[PDB]
């Protein structure tokens, strides 16, 4: 028979089937954890596809007896211990290009929703507020600010971050970015301003947007300490990873007014709920259910790419034939 | 005594007082119609300031016995019969520059809210929807589309329209515009594509945004007939004037799905209410309470400019000293 490939945290395999039909047997688990995956998959699965709703620890990885390649249908892979996976001889890949501009457009929409209060204005109308006079327009829309001259601070000037910077300049934003891993001069190529420390970024930014990956060194990057370094009444946007922000510190900052508003597509604990979590009673909050990446074309694009990567690993040499393996250094 | 200047449809005069203290007596009416204005104002008012919530017909204008200048605190003046005002010897001015970029940023936010469904996703979370799996993310966010390659059609390429076009290009939009009054070649200067007829604009546009003024020739520009010329599942955005769209025709188009969604900051009858009007049961609708213009700096900027214009008219020669009079042709 063919090698077994399993969709860990999902059920739909329609897009991947035409690409893997003659290369592997495809099954799905629809499991939120390794405890929900049948022994057959853990015993015989040679490849694996997964999104962001299941975590793979070293303990989880050790339970796979034949897994040779994990392909994350998406850009982020913080939910996988790529180091231990490489130790166990498991290559890990991702799909980084499918949702770059989708996430940037969602970020700009979140930024504009804070500066223009469009979402809150709409919600006020749905709740029955009557805005007849100009005085009432100013009151209901109180907080909407002029964008030109404002400083947008970008943390992580990667593919998505660069797309955010290019769009932000079209609105008159003055864009700063902090990225301690980029080579010297990337700010000159894109006509941006760069700072060397996170504190400098937070000190000068009227609006801070996160576009870095979650790694072992930037967990709770926005914490009670760094939150005190942000400008009075600053904006916070996060379409990256919920693990980057201490919602406990963010919640208090919103209540006290030190942060005028926050737009979040990712949270420390998902799915997100307005009735649970540290943000239970936090005001001036816009939240989306981790959908900044999604478009019909982006969804199909990343699923087909991931399928081909699984194919290359089963019919080629690992990791030589892999196109987007993220743990070649750790791979044994 | 000094000449009397009256704030027709408002109450707050704090910003204008320091500019007019030694030039005119300032009073406010806070009236939605001429029927609520005291006889003293109609008899002695030499100047008048007004926003968009009161209409001035020829019948209304004839009731002023000493009015010599009307200054609209804003860009649009469709709520005034400038032709009859000029006939009666009444100069009419506006403030066109204060909210150009504010309105453009609100427009882009409305456009992004349609393509990214950020507002609807937020509202779904506030209503309690649980989005745990990727399949549920696609379902709840169903309709979010990739922006690059889409065609944004602009109706009216004025100051705001041009600002919208410049921003729209940063997202990968291919921008078309229809403006039968612009001189030949304005499309080359700004690197845009131009069409000659409204039908051509609607035929090619995936998203149609209105940025023209309401005049005697474009009332119900979007009607049951022209709505049938728009692409299947097109987007409609209106931060211009509610009188440009036939909400009856728009309502049915949304229900039948011929229009995938509409974002409206202006309506045929304001204040807008989700329980009254032709849009009572229309789906896929985003509405803001005529606040696309508002920012703290823009509000102060236009009020101070309008005050100086009233000053120039009282201490100078009409309409020679006026900076933004819009009816010099009709002025006797
Ligand atoms: N702690 C951090 N602070 C700022 N930027 C970071 C941090 N960690 C990673 N990055 C950057 O974030 C960017 C993300 O890349 P991309 O995968 O293209 O979105 C890269 O340029 C990284 O160097
Ligand atoms: N019916 C119409 N269709 C398209 N454009 C129009 C129409 N009426 C006026 N405009 C244009 O809309 C623009 C508005 O100018 P502005 O005052 O700068 O926003 C001007 O360029 C007008 O020529
Ligand atoms: Ca501020
Ligand atoms: Ca379409
Ligand atoms: Cl995902
Ligand atoms: Cl402001
Ligand atoms: Cl899909
Ligand atoms: Cl106004
Ligand atoms: Cl799409
Ligand atoms: Cl004001």
Residue numbers in the entry:
A (entry chain A), B (entry chain A): 26 to 357
Sentences from the paper on this structure:
CtBP1 and CtBP2 regulate cellular processes through binding transcription factors and recruiting chromatin remodeling enzymes such as histone deacetylases, methyl transferases, and demethylases to targeted promoters. Our crystal structures of CtBP1 with AMP reveal participation of the adenosine phosphate in the tetrameric interface, pinpointing its central role in NAD(H)-linked assembly.
Five residues with different amino acid identity between CtBP1 and CtBP2 have atoms within 5 Å of NADH. For each of the five, we mutated the CtBP1 residue to that in CtBP2 to determine the contribution of each to the distinct AMP responses. One particularly interesting mutant, V185T, enhanced tetramerization in the presence of AMP. The basis for the enhanced assembly of CtBP1 V185T became clear from the crystal structure, which revealed a well-ordered water molecule bridging the Thr hydroxyl and a phosphate on AMP in CtBP-V185T. This ordered water molecule stabilizes a cluster of water molecules in the vicinity of bound AMP, which apparently stabilizes bound AMP over that in wild-type CtBP1. Our results also highlighted another important sequence variation, Thr 191 in CtBP2, which is occupied by the isosteric, but nonpolar, Val 185 in the homologous position in CtBP1. It is likely that the hydrogen bond between Thr 191 and the nicotinamide phosphate of NAD(H) contributes to the stabilization of coenzyme binding in CtBP2 that is absent in CtBP1.
